[PDB]
Amino acid sequence: SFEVGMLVWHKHKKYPFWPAVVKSVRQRDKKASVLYIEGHMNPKMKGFTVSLKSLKHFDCKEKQTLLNQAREDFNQDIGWCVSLITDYRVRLGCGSFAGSFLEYYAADISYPVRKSIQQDVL
């Protein structure tokens, strides 16, 4: 039950679970397409292929554990995710915006957050 534009976790070998957004889902044969959320991304870069079985929903019970695991070697980076996802969920929840995470990242309303990130690389 992974829908397109949903937020998920994915683990590449040797790497910790990282958040991502779903772009394609091949519902009827166990595979999906996904793109990592990270401080600087291209939201128009096509989604690399995974399998449904390997995805956790972003808001699963494991969340807090998964987020700490990432803060081991990627504190600043996992920070950049949480900033974006959190900022996106505010616009959504406080009514200021209605599109998808990727649309958030491309729109002018992400600016104030992308600025902090992009510059933090400074």
Numbering used by the authors: 409 to 530
Q: What do the paper's sentences say?
A:
The PWWP domain comprises 100–130 amine acids and is often present in chromatin-associated proteins. Our structures revealed that the overall fold of the PWWP domain consists of three motifs: a canonical β-barrel core, an insertion motif between the second and third β-strands and a C-terminal α-helix bundle. The canonical β-barrel core harbors an aromatic cage constructed by three aromatic residues, which is a signature feature of the Tudor domain “Royal family”. Taken together, similar to other members in the ‘Royal family’, PWWP domain also exhibits methyllysine histone binding ability.
In order to explore the functional roles of the PWWP domains, we determined the crystal structures of the PWWP domains from 7 different human proteins, namely, BRPF1 (bromodomain and PHD finger-containing protein 1), BRPF2, BRPF3, MUM1 (melanoma associated antigen (mutated) 1), DNMT3A, DNMT3B and HDGF2 (Hepatoma-derived growth factor 2). By fluorescence polarization assay, we found that the PWWP domains in BRPF1, BRPF2, HDGF2, MUM1 and the N-terminal PWWP domains of WHSC1 and WHSC1L1 show weak binding affinity to histones with H3K36, K3K79 or H4K20 methylation.
